[PDB]
Amino acid sequence: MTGKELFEMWKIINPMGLLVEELKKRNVSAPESRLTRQSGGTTALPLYFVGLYCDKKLIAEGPGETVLVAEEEAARVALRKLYGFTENRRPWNY
Amino acid sequence: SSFSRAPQQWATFARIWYLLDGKMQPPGKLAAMASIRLQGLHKPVYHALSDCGDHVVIMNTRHIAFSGNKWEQKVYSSHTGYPGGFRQVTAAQLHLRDPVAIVKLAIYGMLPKNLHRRTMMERLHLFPDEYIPEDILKNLVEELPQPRKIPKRLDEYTQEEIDAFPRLWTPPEDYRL
Amino acid sequence: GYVPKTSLSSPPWPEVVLPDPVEETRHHAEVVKKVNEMIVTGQYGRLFAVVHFASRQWKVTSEDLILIGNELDLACGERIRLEKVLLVGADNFTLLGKPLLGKDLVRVEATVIEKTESWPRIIMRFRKRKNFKKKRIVTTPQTVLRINSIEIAPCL
Amino acid sequence: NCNVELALTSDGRTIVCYHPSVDIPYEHTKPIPREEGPMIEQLSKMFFTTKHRWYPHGRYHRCRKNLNPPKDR
Amino acid sequence: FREVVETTIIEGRITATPKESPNPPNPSGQCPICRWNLKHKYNYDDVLLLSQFIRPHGGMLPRKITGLCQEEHRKIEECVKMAHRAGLLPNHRPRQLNRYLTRWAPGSVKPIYKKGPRWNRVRMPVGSPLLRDNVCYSRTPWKLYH
RNA sequence: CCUACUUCACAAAGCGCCUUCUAAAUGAUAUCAUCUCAACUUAAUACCCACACCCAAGAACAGGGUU
Numbered sequence A: 001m002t003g004k005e006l007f008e009m010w011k012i013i014n015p016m017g018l019l020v021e022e023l024k025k026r027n028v029s030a031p032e033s034r035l036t037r038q039s040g041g042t043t044a045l046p047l048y049f050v051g052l053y054c055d056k057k058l059i060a061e062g063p064g065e066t067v068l069v070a071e072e073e074a075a076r077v078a079l080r081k082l083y084g085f086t087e088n089r090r091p092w093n094y
Numbered sequence B: 001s002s003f004s005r006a007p008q009q010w011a012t013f014a015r016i017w018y019l020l021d022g023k024m025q026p027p028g029k030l031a032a033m034a035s036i037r038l039q040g041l042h043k044p045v046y047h048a049l050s051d052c053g054d055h056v057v058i059m060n061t062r063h064i065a066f067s068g069n070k071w072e073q074k075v076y077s078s079h080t081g082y083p084g085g086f087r088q089v090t091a092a093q094l095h096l097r098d099p100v101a102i103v104k105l106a107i108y109g110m111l112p113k114n115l116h117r118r119t120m121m122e123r124l125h126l127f128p129d130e131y132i133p134e135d136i137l138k139n140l141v142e143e144l145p146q147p148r149k150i151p152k153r154l155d156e157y158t159q160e161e162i163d164a165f166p167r168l169w170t171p172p173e174d175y176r177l
Numbered sequence C: 001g002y003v004p005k006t007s008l009s010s011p012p013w014p015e016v017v018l019p020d021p022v023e024e025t026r027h028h029a030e031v032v033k034k035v036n037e038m039i040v041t042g043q044y045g046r047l048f049a050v051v052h053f054a055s056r057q058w059k060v061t062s063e064d065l066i067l068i069g070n071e072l073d074l075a076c077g078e079r080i081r082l083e084k085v086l087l088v089g090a091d092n093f094t095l096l097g098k099p100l101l102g103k104d105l106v107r108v109e110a111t112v113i114e115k116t117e118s119w120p121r122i123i124m125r126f127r128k129r130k131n132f133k134k135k136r137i138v139t140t141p142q143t144v145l146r147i148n149s150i151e152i153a154p155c156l
Numbered sequence D: 001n002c003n004v005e006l007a008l009t010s011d012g013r014t015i016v017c018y019h020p021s022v023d024i025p026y027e028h029t030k031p032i033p034r035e036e037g038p039m040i041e042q043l044s045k046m047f048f049t050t051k052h053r054w055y056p057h058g059r060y061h062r063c064r065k066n067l068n069p070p071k072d073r
Numbered sequence E: 001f002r003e004v005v006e007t008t009i010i011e012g013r014i015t016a017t018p019k020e021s022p023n024p025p026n027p028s029g030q031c032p033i034c035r036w037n038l039k040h041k042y043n044y045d046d047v048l049l050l051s052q053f054i055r056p057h058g059g060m061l062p063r064k065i066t067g068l069c070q071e072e073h074r075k076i077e078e079c080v081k082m083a084h085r086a087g088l089l090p091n092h093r094p095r096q097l098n099r100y101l102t103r104w105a106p107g108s109v110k111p112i113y114k115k116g117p118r119w120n121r122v123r124m125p126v127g128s129p130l131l132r133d134n135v136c137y138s139r140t141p142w143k144l145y146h
Numbered sequence F: 001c002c003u004a005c006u007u008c009a010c011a012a013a014g015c016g017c018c019u020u021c022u023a024a025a026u027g028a029u030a031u032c033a034u035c036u037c038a039a040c041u042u043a044a045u046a047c048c049c050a051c052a053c054c055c056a057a058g059a060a061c062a063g064g065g066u067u
Helices: A015-025 A067-083 B005-013 B027-039 B091-097 B101-110 B117-123 B159-164 C021-040 D037-047 D059-064 E047-052 E070-085 E129-133
Strands: A032-039 A047-054 A057-064 B017-021 B055-059 B065-067 B075-079 B086-090 B142-144 C048-053 C056-061 C064-068 C079-081 C085-089 C093-097 C106-117 C121-127 C132-138 C141-152 D005-008 D014-018 E002-006 E010-014 E098-100
Touching (some): A032 A067, A057 A067, B027 B055, B027 B101, B027 B117, B086 B091, B101 B117, C021 D005, C021 D014, C048 C106, C056 C064, C056 C141, C085 C106, E047 E070, E070 E129
Parallel strands (some): B017 B055, B065 E098
Antiparallel strands (some): A032 A047, A047 A057, C048 C056, C093 D014, C106 C141, E002 E010
């Protein structure tokens, strides 16, 4: 599992529902999805950074080529941060 | 960090749209900023094969300003292939027949002289007035700072500025002006 | 001594004042203390480290591989404490030396994966009309190292 | 963008830099809104590239292109 | 100053004559420029000085009136030309291409139809050699010819 | 371009015919004056653009007509 990200191993569909259920478990309010940064909105190669927020402050943000994909992948990023299986985590101790 | 592979690559290699004011600026400094942005040389990811250039929208390009007498002294030359078709026109005549061509030729000069120059030049959009089409105004991100410090006239001086400036000398009491 | 507000009077660069070293060394002491708490409490994820191995600096993290163009005089599978670490950072802080970090502060430890040689490389010389044509085939020895661990100590 | 905290250590041999990430404020965000020649011309104008990129190549170039290139990461 | 008011009765009337500012930081000079530490500290930008040293119709006053030294009187002359042609003096009229740093009058400059080879290239003059002695806050010096 | 003339005759031609669109005041530096490498003010249109048979279209291919 070295070099493999979470959802290249545990494949899921609709991470937004799993995320809102998880924050329901943590007794945190449902996230607000806000379009933080965007470039080339009307062209064939856009970019959108969508940030998931919880009570005035963001839990995560993620990029994408459209707002739906960006929201979905930001949901995946927030699931990674909540589960602690981040790209920044401590490596395995052998 | 912690993105998936395809969105992380898409975020790294996406191209951005930069607005560039062009009033009271020289065409050369605008061309420097524009060509640095068009080659992708303003990006740490840069490589000449990767084609990581950006879009530059230089507006108000009919109010550029050559430093010096260049408006009567810089000449743009071309030659239609037919015998006797050598056309030399000053910067004034070229700025009157087409008020876009000066900055375009400057940028075309500053770009590297390879086959990517035409695609880089097609990424760039020039507009002569304050008017920009709506389909481009929906894509801009950063308004680049103007390289030349714009000077200001007597009219744009406030009272406090000329009062804070001390006035220097005795005029003779009897002088006609 | 006095020059009025004029274009060449004041410098174009913005005026900046450096703080006097008293409260600046107080600020430095609290920052070093608080980073030391982050180190001792495990407030780091994985660490990266710029490490001056054989003749060149490598941006080394854990779990990864390096190719080195010489015999290292070690059989395969022995571990190594790479001295001359010269930058070590995490998600929130870095520690860079002058020009190195102390051996009590950073432990970077690697394993010798393999001892190969390079692909056969061509050295061909040719001066024209002088009949000058020489050809040599070289294969340079190489060792590949697996960086295992980059751990840090709370000594600041 | 500029906010980090530098500090020389006590004996003055190492430089400790501290740099947390700046999170985007909620107030700085927007809500989510809810033939053959003409083909080359349309694609060129839509992707802001020249026409020359879109014409195909001969079989010799199609065969030298590596089909299973080495993939890293 | 004084004004010649005519209406036929014609008279000359003295009205509203200024004086020195209350303190010069470096007195005992010969010119106001030398007296206010502006010997090498102005440009074509600052139309405060250049507004002081001119008639209300864009002309200058003679050196016998303003008391300037020859060097900075010529400097103020060239800066008047450079500031008028750059469009910085819009209220000093007698009664469109943007410029700045224009040394020569734009009506009498011939275009460089044949610039020479690399060792004899006819350059375009930018700025003026009177302002050569300014204070150099730039790492590389002024290029007066482009 | 072929109505006439001429070589000549389902037409091509000419000798034939038709068409061709730097300068004035004002003015400072140098209070007069001074055209000012001083400031100002004033004195390209058009043309072109959606099988097969015959052809004023044509080397082939193309092009026009086939009611």
